[PDB]
Design a protein around this ligand. Structure first.
Ligand SMILES: *[C@@H]1O[C@H](CO)[C@@H](O[C@@H]2O[C@H](CO)[C@@H](O)[C@H](O)[C@H]2NC(C)=O)[C@H](O)[C@H]1NC(C)=O
Ligand SMILES: O=C1NC(=O)N2Cc3c(c4ccccc4n3Cc3ccc(F)cc3)C[C@@H]12
Ligand SMILES: CCCCC/C=C\C/C=C\C/C=C\C/C=C/CCCC(=O)O
Ligand SMILES: [Ca+2]
Ligand SMILES: [Ca+2]
Ligand SMILES: [Zn+2]
Length: 740
């Protein structure tokens, strides 16, 4: 067959044809041709063996991108001023502004420091369009998981691409970057953007490009595709390049040999932005410049070897690198424990996947091995005993952060927006295309602030179950054991599921007591900068815990949600000790909870001018990130109907303008939050032998989390009574305090 006239169409001649070993004899010959390169000069401003031409040129659409610069005294896009775009400016027949995605492997957010002397083109877009300081990628910080994330709006665990390599026990087969297995669709869940477009009437350019097609041919092909007639022309495109990833691996992020690759990339953007101008589309198309992950210093010698910890190490399969994954070849607890805290300077930590910090959302897929290692930034982990950079580490590490830039009619003009996570982009790009997004993990409306106009105006979820407000019904003999002004500053959480619960009023605190789970869903109370279990007479004993259960539990103890130690008058403390405030806690936990309630809260209140605290339980025995229903709960207090949480949370809110007391706050809010794993021992904190001042705060930071995360795990809805706009609040709720 032949590719005569078929090159990079939509025996094959399309841009994946190599990747499948199946292009026509003359594909290379007719389609990949390089003579005289890709930049016009005077000498040739007057064939068919060339790569781009300099007169069926603009007409047939294979000019070199510089043509009108070189041959018609037009200024490079780069050289023109920054002109705002009040509305898109498209040729007729363009029913909507096209979207072009310029993605780059391994582009670290700080590379943008390097400046317009190396990356002027890329720098015009940032300066001129919409940008943020950096973008958070997903764990694991590797190419294939983050690209599909970007394409889906989903965490890998949901989309199924949980690593560059993976084994699916139900399929019995392994996925690799090199190989033909990846091509099988069965690996791929969610709905990538190209599929969402197609289902809704919008044609898609190809999102993948074979290795062989040089970067310059990829841009020409995209620009060519924009010249097609109305009913064949796609409205969305992606360019992809494997830079800066490739050279960062060889030279390391802080290599000065990184200037050149950043130069090369900035030239390709230039081609593209020149190329658009040439077609008069440079004020039509929205462009997204976007990375998949950062890059970090990593050298051969900083490799831990499992062989140093384990006896039978030939008994295991390790996915190695900047993360570890272990399973059996053909005792889990003994391997975990054989790797728990054996050196003072150990550069990794083992986890039962369900024990990894929830913000990672990395456990709910059968391709995620129970045994997981978090390697330390700058380190490697191998099985047994060239490059200077790598990545894949925890996605809260600064070296792993990456880039976003929006530039176009729909985007905003010279606007800076706070950093955000790549799971939010899907919704946006759907907005930019008037497409209904498929269900995903982005919170729609969190990134409306990036856009001139918004077709999507978010609304608050309807409350599902209404609260009860009980008064004194019962009398203490009936049992058998053994204010909103001050404590509820953003309205009560809305319960987004079916149960029965009560609101409880007190001098020091308010709560949301569950007659089903026998404990508060939440407990809110406020602490200023300068600052025995008895029955609760409003709750039927049938829906009340008992101390008999606890006395009878060999392991389980109990704690309070609102702390006794922060009481306001000896009178008031009697409330701290109500059965309605009491929850199950392992003593290994209590140390942690106690430090938080009795040291760290008053400290947080000194540092931020008061804080509003809402704490509560979380149950996620299935580790799917969602609030558990009863059937799922696998553990109660001995002989009782009293369920044991998997984690506990707190939400800590104040005033961004810290000159204002957390309760006399008129403006934006400052929020931090955690989800602490509820475990029988403190194996996880290698320094937990010591005073709590030497390891708790470290553990807590590791388990920082977004309020949104808390909402999923609770089906509560927070912050519904403020003076801020709802889209701002979504922002507030998507925010993660990273401590990096
Ligand atoms: C991320 O979003 C995905 C899709 O919204 C969620 O997964 C869906 O879970 C719903 C239950 O709400 C199920 O009906 C579907 O089976 C799931 N679909 C897919 C494609 O996985 C997932 O729950 C979200 N993750 C978190 C932690 O919120
Ligand atoms: O090496 C590649 N060559 C190529 O054309 N590549 C795009 C590519 C890759 C990928 C892996 C998983 C899921 C989607 C993927 N894409 C498509 C894509 C491109 C840009 C995006 F913003 C999102 C997805 C790999 C990458
Ligand atoms: C619902 C999904 C619809 C189909 C698309 C889904 C998954 C991707 C399908 C095809 C493209 C995927 C990988 C192509 C490979 C690109 C890099 C070159 C491969 C190689 O180096 O040889
Ligand atoms: Ca006990
Ligand atoms: Ca669950
Ligand atoms: Zn890489």
């Amino acid at each position: 067959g032949s590719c005569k006239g078929r090159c990079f169409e939509l025996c094959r001649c399309d841009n994946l044809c190599k990747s499948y070993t199946s292009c026509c004899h003359d594909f290379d010959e007719l389609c990949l041709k390089t003579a005289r390169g890709w930049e016009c000069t005077k000498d040739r401003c007057g064939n068919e063996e060339n790569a781009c031409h300099c007169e069926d040129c603009l007409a047939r659409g294979d000019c070199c991108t510089n043509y009108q610069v070189v041959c018609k005294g037009e200024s490079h896009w780069v050289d023109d001023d920054c002109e705002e775009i009040k509305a898109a400016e498209c040729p007729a027949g363009f029913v909507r502004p096209p979207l072009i995605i310029f993605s780059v492997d391994g582009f670290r957010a700080s590379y943008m420091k390097k400046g317009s002397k190396v990356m002027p083109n890329i720098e015009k877009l940032r300066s001129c369009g919409t940008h943020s300081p950096y973008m958070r990628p997903v764990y694991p910080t590797k190419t294939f998981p983050n690209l599909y994330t970007l394409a889906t709006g989903l965490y890998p665990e949901s989309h199924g691409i949980v690593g560059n390599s993976m084994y699916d026990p139900v399929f019995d087969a392994t996925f690799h970057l090199r190989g033909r297995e990846k091509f099988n669709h069965r690996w791929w869940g969610g709905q990538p953007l190209w599929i969402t477009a197609t289902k809704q009437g919008v044609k898609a350019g190809t999102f993948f490009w074979s290795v062989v097609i040089p970067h310059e041919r990829r841009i020409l092909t995209i620009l060519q595709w924009l010249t097609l007639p109305d009913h064949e022309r796609p409205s969305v495109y992606a360019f992809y390049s494997e830079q800066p990833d490739f050279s960062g691996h060889k030279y390391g992020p802080f290599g000065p040999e990184m200037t050149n690759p950043l130069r090369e990339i900035d030239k390709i953007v230039g081609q593209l932005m020149d190329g658009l101008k040439q077609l008069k589309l440079h004020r039509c198309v929205n462009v997204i410049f976007v990375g998949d992950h950062g890059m970090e210093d990593v050298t051969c010698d900083r490799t831990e070897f499992l062989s140093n910890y384990l006896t039978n190490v030939d008994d295991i399969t390790l996915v190695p690198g900047t993360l570890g994954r272990i399973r059996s070849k053909f005792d889990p607890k003994a391997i975990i424990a054989n790797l728990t805290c054996k050196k003072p300077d150990q550069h990794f930590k083992p986890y039962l996947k369900q024990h990894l910090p929830k913000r990672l959302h990395y456990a709910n897929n059968r391709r995620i091995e129970d045994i997981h290692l978090l390697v330390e930034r700058r380190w490697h982990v191998a099985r047994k005993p060239f490059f200077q950079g790598d990545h894949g580490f925890d996605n809260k590490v600064n070296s792993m952060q990456t880039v976003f830039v929006g530039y176009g009619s729909t985007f905003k003009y010279k606007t800076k927006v706070p950093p955000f996570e790549n799971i939010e982009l899907y919704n946006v790009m759907c907005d930019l295309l008037g497409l209904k997004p498929a269900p995903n993990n982005g919170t729609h409306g969190s990134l409306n602030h990036l856009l001139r106009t918004n077709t999507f105006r978010p609304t608050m979820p309807e409350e599902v179950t209404r609260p009860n407000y009980p008064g004194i019904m019962y009398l203490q003999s009936d049992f058998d054991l053994g204010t909103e002004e001050r404590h509820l500053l953003y309205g009560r959480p809305a319960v987004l599921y079916r149960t029965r619960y009560d609101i409880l009023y007190h001098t020091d605190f308010e709560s949301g007591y569950s007659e089903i789970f026998l404990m508060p869903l939440w407990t809110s109370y406020t602490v200023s900068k300068q600052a025995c279990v008895r029955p609760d007479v409003r709750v039927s004993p049938s829906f009340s815990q008992n101390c008999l259960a606890y006395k009878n539990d060999k392991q389980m103890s109990y704690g309070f949600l609102f702390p006794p130690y922060l009481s306001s008058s000896p009178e008031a403390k009697y409330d701290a000790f109500l059965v309605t405030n009491m929850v199950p806690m392992y003593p290994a936990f209590k140390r942690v909870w106690n430090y938080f309630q009795r040291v760290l809260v008053k400290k947080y209140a000194s540092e931020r001018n008061g804080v509003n605290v809402i704490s509560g339980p979380i149950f996620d025995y299935d580790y799917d990130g969602l609030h558990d229903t009863e059937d799922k709960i696998k553990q109660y207090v001995e002989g009782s109907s009293i369920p044991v949480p998997t984690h506990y949370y707190s939400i800590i809110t104040s005033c961004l303008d810290f000159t204002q007391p957390a309760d006399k706050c008129d403006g934006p809010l400052s929020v931090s939050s955690f989800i602490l794993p509820h475990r029988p021992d403190n194996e996880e904190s290698c320094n937990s032998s010591e005073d709590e001042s030497k390891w708790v705060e470290e553990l807590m930071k590791m388990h920082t989390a977004r309020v949104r995360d808390i909402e999923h795990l609770t089906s509560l809805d927070f912050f519904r009574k403020t003076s801020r706009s709802y889209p701002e609040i979504l922002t507030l709720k998507t925010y993660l305090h990273t401590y990096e």
